[PDB]
Amino acid sequence: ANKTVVVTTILESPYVMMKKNHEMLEGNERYEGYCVDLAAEIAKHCGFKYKLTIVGDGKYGARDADTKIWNGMVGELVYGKADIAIAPLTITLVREEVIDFSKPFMSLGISIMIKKGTPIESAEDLSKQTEIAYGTLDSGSTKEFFRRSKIAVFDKMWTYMRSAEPSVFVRTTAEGVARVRKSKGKYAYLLESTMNEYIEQRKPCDTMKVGGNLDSKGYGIATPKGSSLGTPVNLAVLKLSEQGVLDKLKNKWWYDKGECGS
Ligand SMILES: CC(C)S(=O)(=O)NC[C@H](C)c1ccc(-c2ccc([C@@H](C)CNS(=O)(=O)C(C)C)cc2)cc1
Ligand SMILES: N[C@@H](Cn1cc(F)c(=O)[nH]c1=O)C(=O)O
């Protein structure tokens, strides 16, 4: 018999956010955002009931080098705590080896966020100077991109970041944004272009995305390897793309109510 599908996701704006009046509500109704809407669409097109859960450790998913244990949403799938992850979870090789990903539902690349007026236009710019500190989320695909890169500029950036004092790494996107906003132009934040573009249209309208993206990739909906949900979820993502629903939802959560003018 069909069983309610446990969805793991993460509190990351504008993907999943607690409604202001969440206390009046319960279950799935507590949350709103792009991935809440996407989860509803996927569930509708696959014919399942579901429960949204926020990942216990608040992480995306990395494997500990020593214990080989996966954390975050990836871990929740790997160890059978959740049936599906619907979140801004980047499709990566190391993850694909242990979980399944749908075709991507959103495109993104690593990007640079500055406080307005910061004299930085590119990654190369960052790499050639020391006055302005810069960093990434302390866990996830952005950090891994730099750790692994063999590209000269990116290698130079990683070599700087890994031993920077005090630390240039942050625990959450909100922390990186706060650091950019409060550091008077002396900190730049490396983050996914999707988050960057969202923040750029939020008050107090003091940040800017600069330069091209450093890579090009996508977020995918993840299931445990061999799960019966993999196929219908993938077909649903294809259908939603083709029917324009993904574009509509991106506009809804990024731009339709942007706070920094037109
Ligand atoms: C991890 C990488 C291999 S990757 O991210 O999967 N691809 C890399 C390559 C540069 C790239 C990167 C991003 C995209 C891309 C294109 C479209 C989308 C959405 C809007 C639709 N995805 S879809 O599969 O084409 C669709 C028919 C449902 C999402 C991602 C396509 C290709
Ligand atoms: N999507 C990433 C997590 N993640 C999120 C961000 F907002 C970011 O800037 N960098 C990053 O790695 C992942 O799946 O690891």
Swiss-Prot record:
Palmitoylated. Depalmitoylated upon L-glutamate stimulation. Ubiquitinated by RNF167, leading to its degradation. The modification Phosphoserine is found at S149, S183. L-glutamate binds at P88, T90, R95, S141, T142, E192. The keyword Hydrolase does not apply. Residues 119-262 are extracellular. Keywords: Cell membrane, Disulfide bond, Glycoprotein, Ion channel, Ion transport, Ligand-gated ion channel, Lipoprotein, Membrane, Palmitate, Phosphoprotein, Postsynaptic cell membrane, Receptor, Signal, Synapse, Transmembrane, Transmembrane helix, Transport, Ubl conjugation. The record marks I120 as: Crucial to convey clamshell closure to channel opening. Its main location: membrane. It comes from the Eukaryota. GO terms for cellular component: AMPA glutamate receptor complex; asymmetric synapse; axon; cell surface; dendrite; dendrite cytoplasm; dendrite membrane; dendritic shaft. Glycans are attached at N2. GO terms for biological process: cellular response to amine stimulus; cellular response to brain-derived neurotrophic factor stimulus; cellular response to glycine; cerebral cortex development; chemical synaptic transmission; conditioned place preference; establishment of protein localization; ionotropic glutamate receptor signaling pathway. It is found in: Cell membrane; Postsynaptic cell membrane; Postsynaptic density membrane. One of its GO terms (molecular function) is PDZ domain binding. The record marks R63, R147, K239 as: Interaction with the cone snail toxin Con-ikot-ikot. Induction: Down-regulated in the pyramidal cell layer of CA1 in the hippocampus by global ischemia. Homotetramer or heterotetramer of pore-forming glutamate receptor subunits. Tetramers may be formed by the dimerization of dimers. May interact with MPP4. Forms a ternary complex with GRIP1 and CSPG4. Interacts with ATAD1 in an ATP-dependent manner. ATAD1-catalyzed ATP hydrolysis disrupts binding to ATAD1 and to GRIP1 and leads to AMPAR complex disassembly. Interacts with GRIP2. Interacts with GRIP1. Interacts with NSF via its C-terminus. Interacts with CACNG2, PICK1 and GRIP2. Interacts with GRIA1 and SYNDIG1. Part of a complex containing GRIA2, NSF and NAPA and/or NAPB. The M4 transmembrane segment mediates tetramerization and is required for cell surface expression. Belongs to the glutamate-gated ion channel (TC 1.A.10.1) family. GRIA2 subfamily. The postsynaptic actions of L-glutamate are mediated by a variety of receptors that are named according to their selective agonists. This receptor binds AMPA (quisqualate) > L-glutamate > kainate. Ionotropic glutamate receptor that functions as a ligand-gated cation channel, gated by L-glutamate and glutamatergic agonists such as alpha-amino-3-hydroxy-5-methyl-4-isoxazolepropionic acid (AMPA), quisqualic acid, and kainic acid. L-glutamate acts as an excitatory neurotransmitter at many synapses in the central nervous system and plays an important role in fast excitatory synaptic transmission. This is Glutamate receptor 2. The gene is Gria2.
